[PDB]
């Protein structure tokens, strides 16, 4: 519209209306020029890592992309509390996205001292991939989100993708994408950008913990009309074989017939946060649960959703079983345990098997007069008819949605790191500075121009999500567990800035506080 | 509307009509960047005072606020005389507030000599707290008013607030606000 | 007054200085030095006795 006019206003709010919540967040972003306007082939050799499990082939692009795929992008900590204490479930419905107040800057550096000026005629390009034609990187739990704290100014991350590799080489089946090959909207400083998106129908994420367990569903006062085999021998001595049967009843609850059984399991190794209880050897990689694809090993991480530990043992955690978040200020490599926050899934132990335990036992032979009954341990158990389970929890720090891979078949496509699986997720939003070449020579040359005016852009983004709520209906008489702050005094308020202006999130906050019957 | 067009005109006047007076005042303001765009926890320890009667906990914000809460913001001394010699009472009724002719400046300092230029694309943000959701500091008799004399150019003061403290520490009942 | 004249809050929108050319997850700590200026008008109707 105009240079001296603003193309949008700041909106950060929550609106709680009945069965729905609407979040809106505005942030300030900065987009650099990436790769100095080049597409580049990258590989593990351009990086230098040699291991087969780590080999890759791909491209880096000049483009950036917006990532709002974490819950703290949309919820303040008070909003999250207000969500999780009152609601049995929630799920996303609609999305509104705006890009406005674009400013392109020119950087000049004569002697190590940068001068910055407005370039009023430069453009930024933006498009959404609404046909899902690009590789989709928003579901890999990458950094670069809109920051949780609204006053922080964030950097737009660089878009890059991988294709098929063999070692560090490509194959004929490998795909290369030019993002210039898509139509996009060009924005000078007066222009703004928007689009809206409709989420596809997904289940409500369950945000409750079961107050009843899968093996206790019986009436404790009454017998079954079913019999179980109680005794195979009369007593000591030879030739004592017999068949004795008893009613399964309140006093022996382990043997009662049950309609539903616990969900599937893939065993994780158990580690203690008391390190002297751990073994004196390196087993982080060697003891890991893994899966193999085309000759390469991937860690099973976080893997199938399983109870983190047994009742009363909170010092143990599955090795690659749980999502692990870092504290504010924590470094990149080889930090101590007090630097990280380890989530635990204990609320699902009512229906989901424990991650560090066997699923159970099966018979391994035919017993006989000459052979004793033998059993063996089930270390991994696929879906059986009659299993029920809970998916993994979502966190304030965690991801919201993933893209379901496009395949012939999938089973229960809920993303393993947690959240809502979608065949058509929120589309990727791509952005770049339009290159402005430096002065060309005065005689024609056929080469592409390699010399550009140094630029970066900045602006505002607003994202608005309508969320559908499932309100708690409970008849429970006694009071629930609620997420709460602690009154006791401290140097800092939690979920606030400190004396240096640094916002931090001191803990992970899951969604499961209220209870339901099983 | 436009760069080369003005978004408002100067109004300083009093209008004495019967049983009512209407004051209007225009001033010129300057807003710096406070805290270099940071929220910061402050306390009596960040200040250094040790006494129990003086202990506090709170925050400073990047924002400024407008303060017209003194009578000389609205009345010239002749107006005030004209008010107090003829009237048994008075009280406020309506308020109109305008913010216009915004100019954002860029400061460059190569060797101790400041250069100042227009930045035509920069914005200022403004809102009123009309639901009274922020801590309210306009009633503490602080400095930073619109100045009594219309030709003076004034500095917008920095917004900051206090919450519950124990000594210099906070408690779980303490509130933090992001504007 | 239980509902006095409301507080009027104002700030300069931060304009970051040039970011680095490789992605970094930190918040940007470097900004273009700015200040703003302008006019304010306030009009009050007063009832007289």
């Amino acid at each position, epitope marked *: 519209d105009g240079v001296g006019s603003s193309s949008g206003n700041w909106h950060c709010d929550s609106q709680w209306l009945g069965d729905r919540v609407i979040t809106t967040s505005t942030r300030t972003w900065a987009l650099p020029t990436y790769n100095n306007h080049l597409y580049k082939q990258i590989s593990n050799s351009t990086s230098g890592g040699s291991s087969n499990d780590n080999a890759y082939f791909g491209y880096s692009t000049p483009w950036g992309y917006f990532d709002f795929n974490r819950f703290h992008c949309h919820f303040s900590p008070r909003d999250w509390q207000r969500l999780i204490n009152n609601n049995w479930g929630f799920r996303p419905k609609r999305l509104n996205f705006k890009l406005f107040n674009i400013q392109v800057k020119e950087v000049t550096d004569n002697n190590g*001292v*940068k*001068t*910055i000026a407005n370039n009023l005629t430069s453009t930024v390009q933006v498009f959404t991939d609404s046909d899902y034609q690009l590789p989709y990187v928003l579901g890999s739990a990458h950094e670069g989100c809109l920051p949780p704290f609204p006053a922080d100014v964030f950097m737009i991350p660089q878009y890059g993708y991988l294709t098929l590799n063999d070692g560090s080489q490509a194959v004929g089946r490998s795909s290369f994408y030019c993002l210039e090959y898509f139509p996009s909207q060009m924005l000078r400083t007066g222009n703004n950008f928007q689009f809206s998106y409709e989420f596809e129908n997904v289940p409500f994420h369950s945000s409750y913990a079961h107050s009843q367990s899968l093996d206790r569903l019986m009436n404790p006062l009454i017998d079954q009309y079913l019999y179980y085999l109680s005794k195979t021998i009369n007593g000591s001595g030879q030739n004592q074989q017999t068949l004795k049967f008893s009613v399964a009843g309140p006093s022996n609850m382990a043997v009662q017939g049950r309609n539903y059984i616990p969900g599937p399991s893939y065993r994780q190794q158990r580690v203690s946060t008391t390190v002297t209880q751990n073994n004196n050897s390196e087993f982080a990689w060697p003891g890991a649960s893994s899966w193999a694809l085309n000759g390469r090993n991937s860690l099973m991480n976080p893997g199938p959703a399983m109870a983190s530990h047994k009742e009363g043992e909170d010092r143990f955690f599955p090795l690659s079983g749980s999502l692990i978040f870092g504290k504010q*200020g*924590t*470094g*990149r*490599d*080889n930090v101590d345990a007090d630097k990280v926050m380890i989530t635990n899934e204990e609320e699902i132990k009512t229906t989901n098997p424990v991650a560090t335990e066997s699923y159970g036992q099966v018979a391994t032979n035919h017993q006989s007069a000459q052979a004793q009954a033998q059993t063996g341990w089930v270390q991994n158990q696929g879906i059986l008819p009659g299993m029920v389970w809970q998916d993994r929890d979502v966190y304030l720090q965690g991801p919201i949605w993933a893209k379901i891979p496009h395949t012939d078949g999938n089973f229960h496509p809920s993303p393993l790191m947690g959240g809502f699986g979608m065949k058509h997720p929120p589309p990727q939003i791509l952005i770049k500075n339009t290159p402005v070449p430096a002065d060309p020579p005065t005689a024609f040359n056929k080469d592409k121009l390699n010399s550009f005016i140094t630029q970066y852009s900045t602006g505002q983004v607003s994202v608005e999500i309508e969320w559908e709520l499932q309100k708690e209906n409970s008849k429970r008489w006694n009071p629930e567990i609620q997420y709460t702050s602690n009154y006791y005094k401290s*140097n800092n308020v939690e979920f606030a800035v*400190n*004396t*240096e*202006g*640094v916002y931090s999130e001191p803990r992970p906050i899951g969604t499961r506080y209220l209870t339901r019957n099983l | 509307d436009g760069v080369g067009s003005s978004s408002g005109n100067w109004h300083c006047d009093s209008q004495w009509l019967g049983d009512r007076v209407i004051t209007t005042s225009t001033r010129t303001w300057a807003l710096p*960047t406070y805290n*270099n*765009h*940071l929220y*910061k*926890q402050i*306390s009596n*320890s*960040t*200040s*250094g005072g040790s006494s129990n009667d003086n202990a506090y906990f709170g925050y400073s914000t990047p924002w400024g606020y407008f303060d017209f809460n003194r009578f000389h913001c609205h009345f010239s001394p002749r107006d005030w005389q004209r008010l107090i010699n003829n009237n048994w009472g008075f009280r406020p009724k309506r308020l109109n507030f305008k913010l216009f002719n915004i100019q954002v400046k*860029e400061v*460059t*300092d*190569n060797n101790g000599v400041k250069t100042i230029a227009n930045n035509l694309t920069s914005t200022v943000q403004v809102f009123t707290d009309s639901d009274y959701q922020l801590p309210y500091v306009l009633g503490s008799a602080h400095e930073g008013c619109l100045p009594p004399f219309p030709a003076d150019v004034f500095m917008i003061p920095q917004y900051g607030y206090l919450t519950l403290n124990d000594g210099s520490q906070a408690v779980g009942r303490s509130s933090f606000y992001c504007l | 007054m239980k509902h006095p004249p409301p507080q009027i809050l104002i700030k300069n929108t931060p304009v970051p*200085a040039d970011p680095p050319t490789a992605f*970094n997850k930190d918040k940007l*700590n*470097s*900004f*273009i*030095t700015q200040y703003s200026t302008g006019q304010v008008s306030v009009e009050i109707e007063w009832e007289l006795q």
Partner: antibody
Amino acid sequence: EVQLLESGGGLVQPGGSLRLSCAASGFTFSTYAMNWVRQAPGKGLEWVAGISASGGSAYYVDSVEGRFTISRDNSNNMLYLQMNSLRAEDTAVYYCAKAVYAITMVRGSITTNYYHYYAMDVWGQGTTVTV
Amino acid sequence: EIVLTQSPGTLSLSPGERATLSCRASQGVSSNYLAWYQQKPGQAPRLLIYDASNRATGIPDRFSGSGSGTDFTLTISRLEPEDFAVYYCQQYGSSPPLTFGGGTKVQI
């Protein structure tokens, strides 16, 4: 010129508490983070404690954690080190540390926030503590 | 605590010769933020280079520095007599504790 002058060190028995004071001039003390560096005889220098310019955040070395307290007074431009439960190993020379950068810096067009811990530009002379 | 090791220990080279010092980091040093200090006998240590290449104010122009990741170098060109001393590398790039390198000595 920036000057860091420390006093209050000396010999004392083990298990005792010794308080070290430091005096700084020629710069705005409030805007600069401060460090304490200790060097044992015939050994490399060891970083002991770090204090934020505000004073809100204080950091200590793993070995002396829980026995040493570091505090600063902005008004009096004084930096203090409190020592409790002294040990034979603790006997070393303690030098005042001044950070190279201020929490905010102006360089031409740009204003920068430096709230982390940075290389130490200016040093005091050192004051010996013997346990 | 992530560790700095100085490969050369108690080094002796003749004056007027180029001197190269290497400090090794166990883990990557965040956004550079390494520092070289010089200490002389019975004398308070002195800042030489902060970050990677950045030279302190009152420092001779013959001192240089460079490095990235886990590998950092302090270079002394046109060696002179006052340059005999013990040298150190400091890592401030992570969260504290700030840890000095072990120390390295340059003889005659």
